[PDB]
Design a binder for this molecule. Structure first.
Ligand code: HEM
Ligand SMILES: CCCCCCCc1ccc(C(=O)O)cc1
Ligand SMILES: [Cl-]
Length: 393
């Protein structure tokens, strides 16, 4: 009954252009079986949304990558939040939710905004820049490590460690194998910065450690929760901002709308997250036999959810393949959905908004003026290089 497909969603050809294969996956049926990796697949909005919102049946504690922690050893100690289920999930989720709170956003917003204006002003002096290294990477690097309370030395380890994390969710292909074999120095740096003495007062990391006395987490849980922010908190935003700039570069009419109303900045970033879905895919593991989209899935099966595909499903979206900065984006799954829905989304949206605000106010045009290169990663979608000429307003 369930269609079997030979599509490899973790192959370079798929990364290079996923959209036709995603339509093939959607149109084959609500649930598919991927013979390449022996996992179930769901690529339509309805089923992706359903799976995300049933954490009891589709659990995370057996891992959200291909590997089933009940069968294999996780490559690093499990995340206490991403790779945990309720109830163990709940209090660590609460702590990170308060660390990354509206009040915290209120404290850092003006610095985040100044840094974005300054970056755009600096890039306009150069004119011809690489929007990945010089903007999508440089801006988050200029605010997030400091907000974490990290020291200066060793920050070069952060993006490699994140690339490693996101590749390690994937199957054991060459991307994953190579990342792991290169991992040791990046892991060592990150794990050491997670210790209380190494996190500057006032920052996210220190605030996690300060929350170890409330009965929500214990002091021995705080380093791995800092580890979560150092895993998730930089590279995601890099590819998110990268996405938004690429969208503005490819859809000049939308840049023109954004210039005319800079208050559209926050939604213009949200749409870019829908449209490019920086985090493309991840897994759940079934804890029981379950009926999903008319198909029966046994206990202990991995299920692969295509977030980027759900975000382009014409069953849910009008003109999904158009970038529309005034779209009602509410309900997209680029940040997940349900109990694990991105706990860092206020930081993400803050960085995204103030960068696109700076662009809206200072830039007249964004023209690609060189070869675009894609970056391949088992989990993340984004570019290696985006040469653009910026014209000042
Ligand atoms: C555009 C940027 C981002 C995107 C697209 C993104 C995407 C996601 C998605 C899809 C999930 C759900 C994973 C799941 O359900 O298994 C998630 C969870 C999470 N994200 Fe984000 N994220 C972004 C930025 C950030 C930032 C800036 C931080 C930290 C400062 C962060 C930290 C986390 C953490 C700790 C979780 C686990 C939450 C939980 O399991 O309850 N993310 N993210
Ligand atoms: C790729 C499938 C999982 C979704 C990834 C979201 C980003 C993220 C990474 C790592 C951690 C962590 O807790 O370590 C938390 C979130
Ligand atoms: Cl690690």
């Amino acid at each position: 009954t369930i269609p079997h497909l030979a599509i490899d969603p973790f192959s370079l050809d798929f990364f290079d252009d996923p959209y036709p294969d995603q339509q093939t996956l959607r149109d084959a049926g609500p649930v598919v079986y991927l013979d390449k990796w022996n996992v179930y697949g769901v690529a339509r909005y309805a089923e992706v949304h359903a799976v995300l919102n049933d954490p009891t049946t589709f659990c995370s504690s057996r891992g959200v990558g291909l590997s089933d922690f009940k069968k294999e050893k996780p490559w690093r100690p499990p995340s206490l939040i991403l790779e945990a289920d309720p109830p163990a999930h709940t209090r660590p989720r609460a702590v990170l939710s308060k660390v990354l709170s509206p009040a915290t956003m209120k404290t850092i917003r003006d610095g985040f905004a100044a840094a974005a204006d300054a970056k755009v002003d600096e890039l306009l002096q150069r004119g011809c820049i690489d929007a990945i290294a010089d903007l999508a990477e440089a801006y988050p690097l200029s605010v997030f490590p400091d907000a974490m309370g990290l020291k200066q030395e060793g920050r070069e380890h952060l993006l490699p460690y994140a690339g490693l994390v996101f590749n390690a969710f994937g199957p054991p292909n060459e991307l994953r194998q190579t990342a792991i074999e290169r991992s040791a120095p990046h892991q060592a740096y990150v794990n050491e910065q997670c210790q209380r003495p190494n996190l500057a007062p006032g920052g996210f990391g220190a605030c996690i450690h300060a929350f170890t006395d409330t009965g929500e987490i214990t002091p021995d849980e705080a380093p791995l929760l800092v580890r979560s922010l150092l895993s998730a908190g930089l590279d995601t935003t890099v590819n998110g901002i990268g996405a938004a700039v690429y969208c503005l570069a490819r859809f000049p009419g939308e840049l023109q709308r954004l210039r005319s109303d800079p208050t559209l900045a926050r939604n213009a970033f949200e749409e870019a997250v829908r449209f490019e879905s920086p985090v493309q895919t991840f897994f759940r593991t079934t804890t029981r036999e379950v009926e999903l989209g008319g198909a029966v899935i046994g206990e202990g099966e991995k299920v692969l959810m295509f977030l980027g595909s759900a975000n382009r499903d014409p069953r849910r979206w009008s003109d999904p393949d158009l970038y529309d900065i005034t779209r009602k984006t509410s309900g997209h799954v680029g940040f997940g959905s349900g109990v694990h829905m991105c706990v860092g989304q206020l930081v993400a949206r803050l960085e995204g908004e103030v960068m696109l605000s700076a662009l809206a106010r200072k830039v007249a045009a964004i023209d690609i003026d060189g070869p675009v290169k894609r970056r391949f990663n088992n989990t993340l979608r984004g570019l290696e290089s985006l040469p653009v000429k910026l014209t000042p307003a």
